[PDB]
Design an enzyme around this catalytic site. Structure first.
Site, PDB file in Angstrom:
ATOM      1  N   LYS A   1      30.338  46.167   5.879  1.00 47.79           N
ATOM      2  CA  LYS A   1      31.337  45.134   5.728  1.00 47.79           C
ATOM      3  C   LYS A   1      32.598  45.717   5.101  1.00 47.79           C
ATOM      4  CE  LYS A   1      28.084  41.349   4.737  1.00 47.79           C
ATOM      5  NZ  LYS A   1      28.508  40.387   5.791  1.00 47.79           N
TER       6      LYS A   1
ATOM      7  N   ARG B   1      18.532  37.064  10.141  1.00 47.46           N
ATOM      8  CA  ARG B   1      17.614  36.514  11.136  1.00 47.46           C
ATOM      9  C   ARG B   1      16.384  37.400  11.381  1.00 47.46           C
ATOM     10  NH1 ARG B   1      22.609  36.263  14.945  1.00 47.46           N
ATOM     11  NH2 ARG B   1      23.329  36.320  12.735  1.00 47.46           N
TER      12      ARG B   1
HETATM   13  C1  BB2 Z   1      29.088  40.548  14.173  1.00 47.31           C
HETATM   14  C2  BB2 Z   1      27.809  40.278  13.397  1.00 47.31           C
HETATM   15  C3  BB2 Z   1      28.082  39.434  12.158  1.00 47.31           C
HETATM   16  C4  BB2 Z   1      26.792  39.233  11.375  1.00 47.31           C
HETATM   17  C5  BB2 Z   1      26.727  37.857  10.717  1.00 47.31           C
HETATM   18  C6  BB2 Z   1      27.790  37.703   9.614  1.00 47.31           C
HETATM   19  C7  BB2 Z   1      27.200  37.116   8.313  1.00 47.31           C
HETATM   20  C8  BB2 Z   1      26.045  37.974   7.790  1.00 47.31           C
HETATM   21  O1  BB2 Z   1      25.964  39.197   7.873  1.00 47.31           O
HETATM   22  N1  BB2 Z   1      24.996  37.451   7.209  1.00 47.31           N
HETATM   23  O2  BB2 Z   1      24.098  38.454   6.855  1.00 47.31           O
HETATM   24  C9  BB2 Z   1      28.969  36.923  10.186  1.00 47.31           C
HETATM   25  O3  BB2 Z   1      28.827  35.937  10.906  1.00 47.31           O
HETATM   26  N2  BB2 Z   1      30.175  37.415   9.896  1.00 47.31           N
HETATM   27  C10 BB2 Z   1      31.428  36.847  10.393  1.00 47.31           C
HETATM   28  C11 BB2 Z   1      31.641  37.217  11.854  1.00 47.31           C
HETATM   29  O4  BB2 Z   1      31.398  38.336  12.286  1.00 47.31           O
HETATM   30  N3  BB2 Z   1      32.044  36.289  12.716  1.00 47.31           N
HETATM   31  C12 BB2 Z   1      31.281  35.890  13.893  1.00 47.31           C
HETATM   32  C13 BB2 Z   1      32.306  35.308  14.859  1.00 47.31           C
HETATM   33  C14 BB2 Z   1      33.630  35.236  14.116  1.00 47.31           C
HETATM   34  C15 BB2 Z   1      33.345  35.600  12.655  1.00 47.31           C
HETATM   35  C16 BB2 Z   1      33.300  34.327  11.789  1.00 47.31           C
HETATM   36  O5  BB2 Z   1      32.272  33.422  12.207  1.00 47.31           O
HETATM   37  C17 BB2 Z   1      32.590  37.216   9.435  1.00 47.31           C
HETATM   38  C18 BB2 Z   1      32.351  36.666   8.026  1.00 47.31           C
HETATM   39  C19 BB2 Z   1      32.894  38.710   9.295  1.00 47.31           C
HETATM   40 MN    MN Z   2      24.654  40.318   7.002  1.00 45.05          MN
END
Ligand code: BB2
Ligand code: MN
Ligand code: BB2
Ligand code: BB2
Ligand code: MN
Ligand code: MN
Ligand code: MN
Ligand code: MN
Ligand code: MN
Lengths: 519, 519, 515
Positions: C295, C369
């Site tokens: 991240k 998940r």
């Molecule tokens: C690509 C894989 C992402 C893994 C899921 C993560 C959250 C996470 O890691 N929980 O463990 C997320 O949804 N993150 C968001 C994200 O990637 N998304 C998904 C679509 C747009 C944007 C916000 O929802 C942001 C916060 C960075």
């Molecule tokens: Mn995560």
């Protein structure tokens, strides 16, 4: 002044949309058996139904059936198609062989979906039509579902689109020469009339055509001329407030958004009143952003790809209104199209500008690309306050937010609704029509604080990004409702359901038709 | 031609700025005790001072004091407020209760700050005014500091702003109906006259109003009309070079920047000469970018939010000039406003364009968003070379660089100055006025090489980022000074001090007033 | 492994969580009027209620009321507070003055919210406690709502948090010396409300705590500490045992980290015939750094909260045991750190899940998940009973916040009846919820994989993301299981600008209470 050649082209395109009639006819097994006498309409035939329905005894007695088709029904995978050749089967084209394509529809359907699964039906028929021997023929599509409305729309949205610019069709007002006449054949004589189903199908494909079309053909101006063309044809009232008139008459929202563009913004209101007592007085409002470039908050090229679709709400409410008139649905309708191009130039409304909305409330623009809610806030005030009647229900439809896709996805439109009863009704209509929907959070107490502005009544965008974005955009629209209005407000976010990988879906019109149908 | 309705609105707004007078009056304890006879002005009263000052014996003898207020002084946290109710205390509104709000000012003040700490004073009074029972009343603010100038400006900038678009104030030329008359009450009769302090306060709040206002109200045109309005009112000379005249007359810099915009750029020069012998001949120059969209180097939406503030330098020198005239400060002043919109369109100056500056030197444009220094380089050449006199001191003020905030921060304006004596004087004025400042590196030998250009005399942006960016921008401006000029040059980067989370601060005018005051 | 000093610190912290008891007591007007005799508990008192409730005649007859407080009620803004001084009012601390703080609660409440509006209540009391004269006193909070459960939780989550590292509280096992005893006075038993409040604040404490204090190991020791205290069974599968025993998901995620991953299952069976057999599963990612899909620093800020689902189901379970709710409960904590190192699971690795299905890892940051898919298989398949209902709670997706927001947890549910029940529980408890699309036919195709059974992430980003993540979890349910599955995405409701909210436990307590 446009170039003479471009005006010729635009005129031609307007006419093509006004005079568009569908390519789909509808009948039943018995009526086909009598009219055609068992002779097939061309060198292709299609068969679509569930695993159990394809094994029903009645299938055997169909006029194309043979021992090969029976095996095809065994071999076919769920969701897929299987094609076979049959030699010397009687047919209108006189082809030595006839191609039979089976397609299996699933029966699995979750509580929030249409049990008929028209989504798959559409795919199956699209696949089958990909092996077409000759264009401008008639293809017999035998369906084994009796859910007539969803299937009618599902087949209308399928196969090759009526808008096309390929192989010199730009010279013929962008009408596809590659489309097949489709004759749908239900088991029973329908439930709804064939002449009615043809209208629903025409509305779906007109909505499709408008959405598909590029913004150099479908401008704010040509869309208005199309509405006018239909007004003259079907005899209903049309009201147009164009360009600077919007500023003079207090419509700061739609004016500010659209004033940058080459073609001026327009608030086009249509009116229909049925013979006899209306069951309900409904006002429709559509987001009609013919192209969303983002304004000064200029979109990056990737997100600006396919923004010709930003008109999709307007095309929905427009074609939904056209069906109501043509079928003489007993609903009193207003249909207000909020037409503008969010363009970038010397006269762009700005990130810091303050708009005086037709509601009278002031809007601090944080981001010009949140243009949709501003244009709609004037649209809904116009409907709830400036019309010859006060509606019982306001339905606004728009390709409003990317958040929609994250929350409800590509097949379900998001619903921000202020009353459980109307939410339930529209939800039901989704399931019946196949143009499905799902609720997003309704909770104004938490949405309002996101729009606090230092110097205006409100901003046009949330302070914080991850806080019910589909809903907050809906709330903004509600603040510009007239205080006269007490009734039911349905906001429909259809950002993604309007399109798929093949282009526009014509989502919206059929959902309306079905909602109206059950009041 | 603008729409008729928008011209009416703009006119109304111009007049609102020209005829703006302050809401603040000033007096002293003894004079209040005699004029009011101990009757309080309304159902709210405020008390502000240091820990030691609040415990001085004189506080007890004040007309709102009681045993509750004495406890409030115990309970109050440094930097915060404490409110209490007092029953049946005599007052002009006849309220059964009167709200007393104590606020404690800190005594901690670093060598680079104003020992009075007006920053906290402003916050304390803003907090206290948040619990206001009725608008359009008069609130008695008892201050226990005798540092009259900084407090006057600190209370002027506080509480609700005079510009507002809320609750239909757009219909009343954007004048806030929510502002309270504030009567400041010093311990001693004030060292400066009340009629003078009122001017300083008016200038602070006018500056505030201009900056706050959105760019759809405050354009290059309306700002010029405001200057003209004041020129007719107070009797001083106004010179305006508008639009294409700038190109004709050699002003390539300000022309190129502003030519893209809908409203043309203008070089507005004002002139004041006092009746006797002037102590000094000073030329002011202000960056008046009414909206900085970035040009073709288009800003992303987040950085383009709040760019209505980019005019803040001009508003400072303008209102600083207005105070000088009104108080008849014995300084001979020029005030040159460099007005333009950095807009994006067909006619935008480009990243590669070469400008011929009024200085005669050529500028290769690397990045159109570095518009401020180009515009100022023409402004300072105009002042040092085209006027009826040669100034002893040139002061240019601008919301010039983001680098400013990184180096000196939100409270201190950055000083690029060519002489220690003048740096010291302006620094002193900062500390006295409360509109504080701090030096950035002066070292032309290391700044110049950053502007090497292949085909022009100079570029408008550093080769390398991370080499005294506040200073390099200042240097660029010095290259366009007239060789006639040999005096003291003060460049004032006030990018951040012009605003805070509540909107504009009115930073600039009071700093000038105080600088002039001590020549 | 660890330095001696750090082990001392960790031990101290474990104990602080195990022996945590609440600071909130509950009573009523009449019982206070008799026990205290009208003498106030300290130099502060708070009054909280709706516009109409503050103007009810009964308010006048309260022991702090006077003509100033009556004006304060006039002057107060909706959603805000107004304070006043009253001289010589009888009180236990002997203060010449007593501060009375009024706070007005709104009555506006949409169909998807709790009509009491405990959200505002929490804010009002937090504001009022900011003007506290002396710490370690007792503050009388007079509430005018009779909705006892939501208020109890709302006041528990309010004011200064029990976890703190300020002013040397690191030396006292991170227990805040700045907390006030709060005595709520209404106009359910007090001993029961105190438990609910303790559970809310324990959940809060765990979530708040930094990952250098709350590791996979110390969280497990805390569960063990409570198991010994309250007498329930605890099962722990630690580190490499997870690989040996087929738990590829939770093993792969957590194996990179310094402290090994653990699948901690707790068990409670009530004395009589249970009304329902429920299995709880919590995402217990003690810190989500993203793994090799590292991240960016901004999104990694506040990822100590990624354990918030586990802390919810854990403290929800503790309440059930302490109150002896007649529900048979399993509570499975999926504990791991998604860490970055030589042994990180990779973007392309294939996991063999405990379900037996293979998962192609597209993105290591979609760790939640995977970890849960092993958790729900464990519950539906490896336990001494088959549950009627599976509830999994997790701080799972950012998509949650976009769809349902900061106050409502997202519900992916397989039956309308159970969705309705949990929704009702939200509105009653104040820890609210809202549905996200349930439509597996459209979710499944997003996980097509070339070489595995499924991927762990959608092919396409804008297609019901809160739901698709839920679907993934359902694919790893046992085929034995045919009952009701409630997936609770609580990514945002677990926290606000002041830190953790203790969201989860009270929602469960209330769901169980009505089944
Ligand atoms: C690509 C894989 C992402 C893994 C899921 C993560 C959250 C996470 O890691 N929980 O463990 C997320 O949804 N993150 C968001 C994200 O990637 N998304 C998904 C679509 C747009 C944007 C916000 O929802 C942001 C916060 C960075
Ligand atoms: Mn995560
Ligand atoms: C900044 C506000 C811009 C307005 C909203 C736009 C849609 C739009 O312009 N409609 O006219 C959007 O889809 N925005 C998305 C968006 O801003 N959001 C909302 C939260 C996260 C992300 C969702 O994709 C992305 C695709 C740009
Ligand atoms: C190429 C732009 C040159 C002009 C500097 C501008 C300010 C501006 O537009 N003035 O009109 C700026 O935004 N400065 C910042 C900036 O460009 N820099 C340089 C490096 C980091 C930062 C310094 O603040 C941005 C990121 C906010
Ligand atoms: Mn749009
Ligand atoms: Mn947009
Ligand atoms: Mn600028
Ligand atoms: Mn710039
Ligand atoms: Mn995570």
């Amino acid at each position: 002044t446009l170039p003479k050649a471009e005006a010729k082209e635009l005129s031609a395109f307007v006419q093509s949309c006004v005079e568009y009639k569908t390519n789909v006819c509808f009948t039943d097994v018995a009526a086909y058996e009598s009219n055609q006498k068992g002779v097939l309409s061309s060198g292709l035939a299609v068969l679509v139904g569930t695993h159990k329905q394809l094994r029903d005894p009645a299938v055997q007695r169909l006029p194309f059936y043979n021992p090969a088709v029976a095996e095809a029904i065994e071999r076919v995978k769920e969701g897929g198609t299987y094609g076979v050749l049959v030699e010397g089967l009687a047919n209108a084209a006189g082809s030595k062989f006839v191609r039979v394509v089976v397609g299996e529809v699933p029966t699995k359907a979750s509580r929030n979906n249409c049990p008929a699964r028209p989504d798959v039906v559409t795919x199956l028929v699209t696949a089958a039509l990909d092996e077409v021997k000759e264009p401008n023929t008639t293809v017999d599509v035998f369906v084994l579902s009796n859910a007539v409305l969803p299937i009618a729309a599902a087949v209308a949205r399928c196969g090759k689109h009526n808008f096309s610019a390929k192989d010199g069709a730009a010279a013929a007002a962008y009408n596809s020469g590659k489309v097949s006449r489709l004759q749908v054949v239900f088991p029973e004589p329908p439930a709804i009339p064939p002449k009615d189903l043809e209208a629903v199908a025409t509305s779906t494909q007109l909505c499709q055509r408008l959405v598909d079309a590029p913004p150099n053909l479908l401008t704010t101006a040509t869309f208005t001329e199309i509405a006018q063309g239909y007004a003259k044809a079907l005899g209903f009232d049309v009201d147009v407030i164009c360009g600077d008139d919007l500023c003079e008459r207090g419509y700061g929202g739609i004016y500010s958004v659209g004033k940058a563009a080459f073609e001026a913004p327009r608030l086009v209101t249509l009116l229909y009143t049925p013979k006899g007592t209306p069951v309900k007085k409904v006002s429709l409002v559509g987001k009609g952003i013919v192209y969303d470039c983002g304004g000064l908050a200029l979109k990056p090229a990737d997100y600006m790809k396919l923004m010709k679709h930003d008109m999709g709400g307007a095309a929905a409410v427009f074609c939904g209104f056209l069906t109501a008139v043509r079928l003489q649905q007993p609903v009193q309708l207003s249909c207000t199209l909020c037409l503008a191009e969010n363009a970038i130039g010397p006269k762009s409304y700005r990130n810091d500008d303050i708009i005086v909305m037709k509601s009278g409330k002031t809007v601090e623009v944080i981001n010009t690309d949140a243009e949709g809610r501003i244009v709609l806030g004037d649209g809904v005030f116009h409907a709830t306050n400036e019309l010859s009647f006060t509606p019982d229900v306001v339905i606004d439809m728009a390709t409003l937010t990317g958040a929609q896709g994250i929350a409800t996805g590509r097949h379900h439109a998001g619903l921000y609704v202020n009353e459980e009863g109307a939410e339930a009704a529209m939800l039901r209509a989704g399931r019946e029509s196949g143009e499905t929907c799902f609720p997003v959070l309704y909770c104004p107490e938490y949405h309002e604080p996101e729009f606090k502005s230092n110097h205006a009544d409100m901003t046009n965008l949330m302070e914080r990004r991850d806080n019910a974005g589909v809903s907050c955009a809906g709330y903004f629209i509600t603040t510009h409702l007239s205080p006269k209005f007490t009734g039911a407000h349905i906001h429909v976010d259809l950002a993604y359901p309007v399109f798929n990988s093949n282009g526009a879906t014509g989502f919206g019109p059929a959902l309306l038709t079905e909602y109206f149908r059950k009041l």
